[PDB]
Amino acid sequence: IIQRNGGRWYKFDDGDVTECKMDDDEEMKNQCFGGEYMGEVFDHMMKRMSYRRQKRWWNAYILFYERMQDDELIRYISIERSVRKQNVQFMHNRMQYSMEYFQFMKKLLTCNGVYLNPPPGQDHLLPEAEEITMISIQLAARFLFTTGFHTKKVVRGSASDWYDALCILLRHSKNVRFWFAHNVLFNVSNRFSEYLLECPSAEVRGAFAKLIVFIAHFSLQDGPCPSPFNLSLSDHLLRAVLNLLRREVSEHGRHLQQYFNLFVMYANLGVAEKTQLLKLSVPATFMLVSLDEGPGPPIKYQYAELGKLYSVVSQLIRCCNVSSRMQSSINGNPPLPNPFGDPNLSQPIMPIQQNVADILFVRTSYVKKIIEDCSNSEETVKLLRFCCWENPQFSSTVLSELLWQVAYSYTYELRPYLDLLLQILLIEDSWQTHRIHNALKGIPDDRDGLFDTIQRSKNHYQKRAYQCIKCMVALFSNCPVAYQILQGNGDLKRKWTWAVEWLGDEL
Amino acid sequence: EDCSNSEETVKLLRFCCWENPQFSSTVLSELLWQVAYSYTYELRPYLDLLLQILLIEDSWQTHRIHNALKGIPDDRDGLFDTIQRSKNHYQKRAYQCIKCMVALFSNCPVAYQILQGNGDLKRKWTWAVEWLGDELERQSNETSNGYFLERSHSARMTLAKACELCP
Amino acid sequence: TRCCMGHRPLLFFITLLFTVLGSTARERAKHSGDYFTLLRHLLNYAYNSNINVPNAEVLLNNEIDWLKRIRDDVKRTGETGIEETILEGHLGVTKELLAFQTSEKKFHIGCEKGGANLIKELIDDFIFPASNVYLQYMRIPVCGSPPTINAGFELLVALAVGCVRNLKQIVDSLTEMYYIGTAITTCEALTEWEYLPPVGPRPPKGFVGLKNAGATCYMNSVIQQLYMIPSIRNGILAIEGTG
């Protein structure tokens, strides 16, 4: 359509109004004049060219011509309200989401920050900065949890910055930290669910999780918070976060990495937190999950990323006392001290608790799960090397599972398993000789050994036997005790021969 | 072992494996043992009997279906495990275990409200079916003698019927 | 900053520039942009480096007078009587110059019963005049451009820094405009996790289209063609009493 102006054409398609370059006659041919044309077709990843006769299925349909506000047409012969109201609303709602409104909120909240530090000879804020924090936390709560975190990244702008802005207010003051929890977290009964699991944005879940860690941490020295349905605030926050395992965690797979960093980062703090986590049976309820035996339905998503559910249990268990569960192999000797526990920590927090021991030691479902799934990580090696240490039955369980996967698993994923096998054989305790024995011979009448899987796979799946040799070559060259078992046991010595020529001949 | 493909054995097992966790544990324990340690062609009757134990609509049906796919607890005696034994060799044992499952989900709603809704099985189910699809691309029935797979019509339509259960 | 190593050269400039005002500084009105931003830089260096400007308050009170009249400019015309870049700086200079006042000032300006209620002004005259219409309905901004919309904000923030009595009003007012509708006891949400206004800004030289329901293209195109006709547009809207 032409616009009647005092000094053009425009593009009018549906609700879109833009400028157009059809003043040139070539564009008139391209869009409205239609017709058949010799077309150019590119296909086959831009490698094949062919020319096709194409019809311009876009073409002019109805045309209007204008001859070169008449009072006669208004003469007889025989509201601005709705316009205003929707115009008013759009002006109002345009400003709420304007990009420079968000940069206004940051300045309003992050300013006065230099006034928010407590006096150096005091561990709390004087009346003024107490009230400045009180007012600002009211607005930061109002803005962020109504329209702040839901706005798109282009305007909302890296919600970690909002977490930094919230950190300035929330710390250094107790009542403010109490106000926030009891007014924007323990009032909705869906706050933790919608922001940790339901939110389809990595930054927002991460920023919210880091916020819960922050509030729970700095509320440890605070007094007993009232129960929101002698418990501190961090006691309530973890309880509410753990209440998601009942139904929502099962419903909301594919959003879980940031739900478990709430516990991964809450453990990387110190000993006062790990003690709290252990007393909540966090490891005990987390091994049940990923076994689908937890307090609720199983996780419904196939490729759920539980890699941080294991790293919490790994860190939490490697703070306990397995003293009552080691056997010394060489009879009479005492069990060796554990050199694979927690560094940055003097003495075990508590004896390893019962229900955890019944899932890790007595049973063997968990050990299957972490070895099968989370083998490439390094929080599993630390848990295995901490439990396999002079534990005869457990060290067999890990070998039973590892020998199963090195044999009966898919040929392209052996390296995560084989490389994990080393740091189980390279444990220099009183049971080391057995582990090299029950990895080369195999546990009899069920699981093969490193030599047995080689025989089973020379003809077909030759890549399986090759990767097994790489493990063995690496083990012998870097383990002396392995060399005196290879050199000293003729059968293993003799089998090791046939292995080396086969690798050569296949090459 | 002996009277498996008869009609009065299924009737007795179905009569005692009703609301009886102890008995149904033994019947599944033995059947899963016989599914593992048997000739790939003498295996058809045992699976066909396994279905009819799973399709008993008592209160333990979900429990019974669980301890047939995962396995008798913390042991590697289960349908998804016997597939893993015989995935590189004796491949006819895995296919018949898969064809058992295909006939299970397609005929038991409660067995399809576990597969779609548990994830880990649904992960392993995807692992099994993709292997079958990769095995039929690298003529007598698989329920007869042979060693590798015998890529017949029996398989190629149970593979196409498997890949409509895994979305 | 560096070559002076002394608190003398800047004062000569400070006065020098503040000397130029709605004189030649107004005359350019397009090249004064780089003038104004420097003016912040020198004033900013004065505060953070604890350099005391002699003539602080006297200059500042003129800016309120400067901003008060132009508040009436739109109130009298509907279009601002100054160019956009001058408003950029006169708001910007007010910020840095607002730093050289105590909390007894900076509240005698904002929230004061007898003072020039400048926090009231920027809220409901410069930046959010539309929301006041909307709130009155639940019963033309001076800053139009995004650079000028911004400029009203860091002035608002500077009114709250170090003054809880001014911060309270700014935070209170923002509640009754945007977050009183629901956030009285509970904080609801938009329920859409990546939300923007779905209508759009209606670019000025652009025009208002018509939404399509999926198969209403045939009727949308007809209406667009009919409205542009000056006779149809003027004549039909003149047909009164159709309700």
Curated annotation (Swiss-Prot), chain C:
It is found in: Cytoplasm, Cytosol; Cell projection, Growth cone; Cytoplasm, Cytoskeleton, Cilium axoneme. Changing C217S: Abolished deubiquitinase activity. Induction: By growth factors. Widely expressed in embryonic and adult tissues. The active site is at C217 (nucleophile). Changing C217A: Does not restore RICTOR expression levels when introduced into cells where endogenous USP9X has been silenced. It is linked to Intellectual developmental disorder, X-linked 99: A disorder characterized by significantly below average general intellectual functioning associated with impairments in adaptive behavior and manifested during the developmental period. Intellectual deficiency is the only primary symptom of non-syndromic X-linked forms, while syndromic forms present with associated physical, neurological and/or psychiatric manifestations. Intellectual developmental disorder, X-linked 99, syndromic, female-restricted: A form of intellectual disability, a disorder characterized by significantly below average general intellectual functioning, associated with impairments in adaptive behavior and manifested during the developmental period. Escapes X-inactivation. Belongs to the peptidase C19 family. Deubiquitinase involved both in the processing of ubiquitin precursors and of ubiquitinated proteins. May therefore play an important regulatory role at the level of protein turnover by preventing degradation of proteins through the removal of conjugated ubiquitin. Specifically hydrolyzes 'Lys-11'-, followed by 'Lys-63'-, 'Lys-48'- and 'Lys-6'-linked polyubiquitins chains. Essential component of TGF-beta/BMP signaling cascade. Specifically deubiquitinates monoubiquitinated SMAD4, opposing the activity of E3 ubiquitin-protein ligase TRIM33. Deubiquitinates alkylation repair enzyme ALKBH3. Interacts with SMAD4, MARK4, NUAK1 and BIRC5/survivin. Interacts with DCX. Interacts with OTUD4 and USP7; the interaction is direct. This is Ubiquitin carboxyl-terminal hydrolase 9X. It comes from Homo sapiens. The lineage of its organism: Eukaryota, Metazoa, Chordata, Craniata, Vertebrata.
